Subunit: 449 residues, 4 copies
């Protein structure tokens, strides 16, 4: 075998991450082998101690990888032999590297998803709490990055929490299909020794066992969807990244990141660069990249097993480490950023109540198109008089429409503006509180696993 | 008001597919506007009566679009106004285009999804049913596209059916997040007229209402999911298309497609090209593209609404039609293709039973490594004698290991070979049957 | 054939766009069939008269399509027969639809790329000229979207002209490989009747001819790189859009779009939505998708021809009309946007000059590290006295380092600040003026590359 | 300061690959720094002495790292400070880490592209040379993965060589845009000390210098272009891998890969698994992933520098190494693979010559349709008499058309079949020879300018 080939085929570098799960998978298989009558009670005991010792070497970071080790599987097989003798060879009876690969990677994914869940929920929890505490703060709502209408700083935070919560539900859905045992599938036709797959299921703690050996070996649906969900979740973070970065400029001045999540120079001690947020926005590309790569690897592949499939491991490991890092950095930013209630308050302008003034007429029976026009004049009449809209005269307004009354003054209040949105999901205070309740009930259920 | 700029906004060319759903949403909103007092019982009467005729117009293909109509929403907005007068204007009270866009698309998707589902369950049923009938057939199981071990053709068909079964599951899931009402979100802060969203929910038949107005106007998670599940579905089909394409070459000769799904020529009557399978294989790329575009569109956009979001429509609509066509074509190919039991069988060689020769010794007590060596020495010994290992003499095998008894003959039998895989999920007959039962029960939980 | 399968093959809707180039290809081939002996001069004349007739029917827009037409190559094949009958059949002698497809597509791309370049050079021109006019405007330069060292507005404008100019170079390069004649490759083994390929080349005006029939028929490199370069170009525009969109926010107040390329309402008539720029940003995704699809279509496909290759047509045309419209709208926006020198100036602040203050000590000999510390103490003490750095005293300054002189008073001036960058590529006026000459030249050469 | 945050910056793990080039970028800025006046001739010698030492510690594996060094630059600076003292600091005068990263990346790409280019040409030479030697082998060419008509093995090999040739040309175009110096751009406004950029260019050996500092700092075109080109190249390989994998099946039995590039078991000695081709085909996705990723990263970014740009380094290094191995593995696969002339020949059938039998009539003046129809009858007749068309009798064929003459017996010969395609690009032997010479010529050109 050519050197440049075996190097390109090598995977020991990164798949060492599967060392622990590889062992657990062999332990279970050994146990079931004993039940099948392939191993004796004695041999099994020799294989477990051996395997467990190998487990310790890795955990202690003392395992010795050698030149020959093509992958983590061979590595672990070599060690067991060195440690217990040719007896270790009986372990591979009926087994196939083909099924180890998917078994280990799924085991690794289950464990990984457990951690990603934790951090993902902590991020959501962090956004919801902040929304609860700052429920009074109001600032501009944007469209086309232009000021549209007032909204509660909380409605903004909750819109992100809501999106991230759908991400938590999707992750949960992926987890169920990853939680299905492929071991006992052989090279492609099944285990040839009537292995007790049910027993294998509960040793590894999988929810159920794979239905078809050919599919179980050649499918990488779990990788694709984990990657797809990972990507959409990063898309949500990239969106939030964009928001905070813009809000964190000096032009906007709505908030300032904490020292731990920013960079700056002594020459401009007040300037803070949102490195953390930019780092996170970029990971969306990194993750999408991995998703696209695997979608391309699977397309057109004949059945059953093909070497092309080996590309999954690295992609899955990178994305796992990417999410873990990114979620935690996100939690921190949101937790420690400093808002300027004063600046957000100043961003609220009279111009932004032209919409509200139109609605005021609508409530008094005036038709949509006419009220709109009416407010249109008030806004124009204000330009002429060279004054802000809230300082026009009741006498001025009345020249526009008889329907304006002393009670029109309330329109020019921002709290009144937001409180207009009581309908479920709106930005009114009750609606913000309703959302914080809904999201907490949601997280209690999603975590009840 | 710039000529080319206008060209880019025009969507009316493709979004007329939302004509009926747009009308239904306006109908639901009007009703709620009456309940809020924005419209009088009378006004409502006249608004629906109009909306209804706009619907009937579209359904009957009679609706007539004008050069000024820049998109389906504007078209119905203009048609209603010229059918009932200035009164039409009150219909837009407190309502935002930002919310019509998502409401209509979610309705369109919900509907298309039922249709997709029916076509998908049909494909699955065709594979399962065929696996049931051709269960006795046996052919090579491949790895690296080299003959690995003997498998049942049914196991091959069910592996694909199982994969599509997961596709059906994901679809249902996407469906639940799509079946949520976004109406009453305003342009971003919500409905300013305390609209009854529960009423709108019931009228339109959604399962629940969107939780946050900002999130509801700006997210296209529902699109990305649909495109992702769709791409994976197509990936599965691109895999099946490849197997059948290779299996239908004259070299392999396992099957032949019907004339309905193949092309040929008069100079070579027996030659059949599987372009139905080729079209299908290529659509995996098409669908993948739409997925990549929307992702790219969403990345980095700030809250809340941004013109960029308008790209979703065309992508969703294409993928929906592509899926509907591809599935039906898939089903036909599967049920009318003709397999050659003879050729699939002549393809099984004794060289594939060397693995079985070793298991034989393993079942007789020998540990794996030595069994593999023994089987290997027998394989080698045969090359030496220039014959097939199934033609070795018992004396020849005992020459390699006393463990070999006269019964070893039972090894060189392809039925006995596949019948070793009884463990759940294997290719053994009992196990294939079990898969068929399990799949029938899933198809049933799927319909529900 | 199955009904749904027929819908899957129907490409007539979008491929009519190749009607003209298809007819040009037939004419070429036809004439080459005469020279080959397969046709008589008489026959050629009767076929050309028919083809020419069809051409007009498309150009006049009066061609009637039948529900029988699955694709453009069929519509013409039939229509020619309706016109001249049986003699039309000889035109397809030795020809393969597999070669009609790429030939027609390469012709359409050539014609198209010629249109696209026109618009691209025009966009680049716009930026460059406007750059010269507004060469005096100065505003903040950003990194991390936070203010760094001030720069000239023109420098900004030119950064986009330069990137766009590389896009133009890449298109020129794609144009070359596209401009290779595939006609005469047959189904996959080449033309069997020894047709004069070079003659077809001349007639069709291709630079050269394809080297391998199998490669010619099965490759789609020309589609891939075309979508590739377009995608990069859109990336550049998506970046420029992000810039202008943000610069157009009332929060920044640096510029405003004309009404022709914006949106707004009567309630807030003083506000403008950057619709144009947002559409364009979104189109980067659209184009990228088309790129992704063809890449997936082609991966792992076997030699030589497969129906899969049919997915190229639509993608190409879509990307062509997107580029064509996006560039035009992009030129309009840049052309009509109104800036605010008043605000771009204000955004310029004293804190942005601490760097210059430190450089100042470098010019006077002090090493970088020590000078960095020096400037540090300076902006720090300016804080203590609660005053802007520019107002410290020569003594306050002298207390930090004896090296401070009274000339440091020039340090607190923006124009001087930008004028520090005289090295090629920098924002200094002469460096900017130089770039404007270079761009004009590059555009000259590219313009004269067609 | 946050720990997780710091693991996301630690690029040392992979950017060490810029160690040597980073040092060269500095050795060049120092020398330029001296000319500017910032350094003394004695200082320069001192600084260069350090760098020139640091360069060795890496090129010998001794450069000890530190869990304080986030990136390769910080690592290289640290070791310079330790080697020469506070004088090192001056090396950073006016220099911005923003320009160091682009400078280092392009230099690393210029070097890598040159190595890659060598392997690419080796692959191409391996296919063109083998095509010459095995130019007589004839096998069926496929469309829709079905048999269409005889072709020369060499016509197949050359088609892949031709596609790879265009990759070679694209890579060459990309190298010219990467060979442009961005050093001297500062943080975004340019170098503030009038550094001599021409001196830098010459020292580092670039062809020209960047035109605009803002662009030079923020553009990642060179990463995108390289990724695009590398993806098309891999697609080409994914297609070659598919053909060879399929041709290596026992079903086709056309060729066999060597053990060095295959896998198998003692249980089935003859079975050989094309792992080499499979690994290669899969990389098409991996490399494409990198391209998708960077395109998303740049899309929508505002000017100028943004931390996001930091995702370029790893993608580039990964594709460089992926391209390097894949190309060598391919060359080894083609060169050491064994073909089966016998089986390639047994695959050629008479049914495949009906087409030729039709062209036989055409060349004698019969119109296509009539000739095609006529060939159809010969085929049906053969079914009738239950024999192959080469067995039909002259009297038999006459009964179909009086145009058939005894010389028609020469239609039924496979060498004769391929020989019909003499038109430039076709599968005839003279064409295959012209192609080989044309390719040998191209490689020459593309090799000289590399």
């Amino acid at each position: 075998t050519d050197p440049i080939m075996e190097k390109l085929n090598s995977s020991i570098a990164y798949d060492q991450r599967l060392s622990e799960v590889d062992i657990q998978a062999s332990i279970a298989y050994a146990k079931a082998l004993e039940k099948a009558g392939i191993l004796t009670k004695t041999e099994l005991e020799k294989i477990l101690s051996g395997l467990e010792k190998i487990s310790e070497e890795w955990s202690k970071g003392v395992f010795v990888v050698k030149q020959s080790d093509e992958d983590i599987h061979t590595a672990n097989e070599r060690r067991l032999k060195e440690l217990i003798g040719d007896i270790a060879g009986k372990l591979h009876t009926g087994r196939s590297r083909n099924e180890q690969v998917v078994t280990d990677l799924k085991l690794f994914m289950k464990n990984s998803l457990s951690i990603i869940s934790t951090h993902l929920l902590q991020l959501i929890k962090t956004l919801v709490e902040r929304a609860a505490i700052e429920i009074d703060v109001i600032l501009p709502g944007y469209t086309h990055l232009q000021k549209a209408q007032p909204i509660r700083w909380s409605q903004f935070l909750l819109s992100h929490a809501v999106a991230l919560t759908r991400d938590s539900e999707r992750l949960g859905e992926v987890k169920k299909r990853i939680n299905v045992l492929p071991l006992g599938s052989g090279a492609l036709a099944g285990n040839p020794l009537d292995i007790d797959r049910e027993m294998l299921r509960s040793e590894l703690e999988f929810a159920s066992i794979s239905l078809n050996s050919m599919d179980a070996i050649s499918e990488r649906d779990f990788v694709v969807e984990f990657l797809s969900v990972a990507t959409l979740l990063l898309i949500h973070l990239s969106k939030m990244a964009e928001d905070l970065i813009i809000y964190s400029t000096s032009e906007f001045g709505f908030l300032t990141l904490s020292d731990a999540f920013s960079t700056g120079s002594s020459l401009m001690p007040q300037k803070k660069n949102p490195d953390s947020l930019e780092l996170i926005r970029s990971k969306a590309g990194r993750v999408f990249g991995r998703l696209a790569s695997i979608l391309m690897v699977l397309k057109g592949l004949p059945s059953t097993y093909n070497k092309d499939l080996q590309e999954d491991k690295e992609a899955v490991i990178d994305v796992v480490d990417t999410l873990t890092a990114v979620l935690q950095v996100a939690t921190g930013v949101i937790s420690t950023l400093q808002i300027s209630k004063e600046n957000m308050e100043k961003a609220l302008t009279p111009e932004m109540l032209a919409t509200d003034l139109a609605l005021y007429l609508v409530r008094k029976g005036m038709p949509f198109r006419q009220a709109h026009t009416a407010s249109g004049k008030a806004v124009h009449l204000a330009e002429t008089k060279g004054i802000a809209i809230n300082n026009l005269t009741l006498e001025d307004l009345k020249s526009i429409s008889p329907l304006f009354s002393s009670d029109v003054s309330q329109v020019f209040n921002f709290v009144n503006s937001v409180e207009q949105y009581t309908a479920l999901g709106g930005t009114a205070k009750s609606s913000v509180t309703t959302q914080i309740e809904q999201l907490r009930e949601l997280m209690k259920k999603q975590k009840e696993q």
